[PDB]
Design a protein around this ligand. Structure first.
Ligand SMILES: [Ca+2]
Ligand SMILES: [Ca+2]
Ligand SMILES: [Ca+2]
Ligand SMILES: [Ca+2]
Ligand SMILES: [Ca+2]
Ligand SMILES: [Ca+2]
Ligand SMILES: [Zn+2]
Length: 279
């Protein structure tokens, strides 16, 4: 996707000193946030679930393609790397105004990313999507279409930094994928109701019958929902995927679902407030 800004880096994990190292290299095609058509980008870094534990890059002014070249060390036992996530928040720095969020990226299982290779840099697209003091969360899922059989399969993988929705302290999240074509909702499908977490893992496949002469014109709206009871469930966040999707990243994902027929494509998406789209 063209209008989709992205950032590159590299990371290795020195055992024997239990240290996750992370080099932020450079970003490209960042969104402008200044009236001058640019941004003064810098990136906050977290290592979930540790919410405070942040590093910050220098604040490169006037550029949509910063070259950070900064490195950061984290003390994590090998046993913990799996139960852990990196999380970058890209921001535009501002003098006279609240700093503008450019986007966020979530780094899934850190172990595998680091274990190899070294200085073949890896890229992730910066997830544009509203984030007030309270972020709704990111949702990870695959996407695989068998044209020969008309099976389109979603497969909800996991979610990160969901919004707490219960007084108890968390949310009892499940995921509602629903087929959309030309504004009409055609078919819904739910997942398990994993309870009392904000970083759920599903690995559950949702499947839809869709003719090959029709995929191009269909799409789906996924939405993480906090269970509550009987019929009073309250939504946490939503995300579109398919043509006619607001976010380029949203339709680039459906775009590459086709073009790679029997291959599942994994991608992170930013959960966004329900009232910024409309079926
Ligand atoms: Ca600005
Ligand atoms: Ca600025
Ligand atoms: Ca501002
Ligand atoms: Ca609730
Ligand atoms: Ca509960
Ligand atoms: Ca609940
Ligand atoms: Zn993208």
């Amino acid at each position: 996707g063209a209008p989709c800004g992205r950032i590159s880096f590299a990371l290795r994990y020195l055992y024997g000193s239990d240290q996750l190292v992370v080099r932020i290299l450079q970003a490209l095609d960042l969104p402008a946030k200044d009236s001058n058509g640019f941004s003064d980008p810098y990136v906050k870094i977290y290592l979930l679930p540790d919410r405070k534990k942040k590093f910050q890059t220098k604040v490169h002014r006037k550029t949509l393609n910063p070259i950070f070249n900064e490195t950061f060390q984290f003390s994590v036992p090998l046993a913990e790397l799996a139960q852990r996530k990196l999380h970058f928040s890209v921001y535009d720095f501002d003098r006279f105004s609240r700093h503008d969020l450019i986007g966020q990226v979530v780094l899934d299982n850190l172990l595998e990313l680091a274990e190899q290779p070294p200085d073949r840099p890896l890229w992730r697209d910066i997830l544009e999507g509203g984030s007030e003091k309270a972020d709704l969360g990111e949702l990870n899922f695959s996407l695989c279409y068998l044209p020969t059989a008309g099976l389109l399969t979603v497969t909800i993988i996991k979610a990160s930094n969901l919004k707490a929705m219960d007084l108890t302290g968390f949310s009892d999240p499940y995921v509602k994928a629903s087929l959309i074509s030309e504004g009409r909702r055609l078919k819904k499908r739910k997942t398990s109701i994993k309870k009392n977490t904000l970083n759920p893992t599903y690995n559950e496949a949702l499947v839809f019958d869709v003719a090959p002469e029709s995929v191009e014109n269909v799409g789906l709206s996924i939405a993480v929902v906090d269970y509550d009871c009987i019929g009073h469930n309250e939504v946490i966040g939503v995300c579109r995927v398919g043509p006619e999707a607001a976010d380029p990243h949203g339709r680039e994902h459906w775009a590459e679902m086709l073009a790679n027929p029997r291959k599942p494509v994994e991608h992170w998406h930013q959960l966004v407030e329900e009232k910024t789209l409309s079926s």
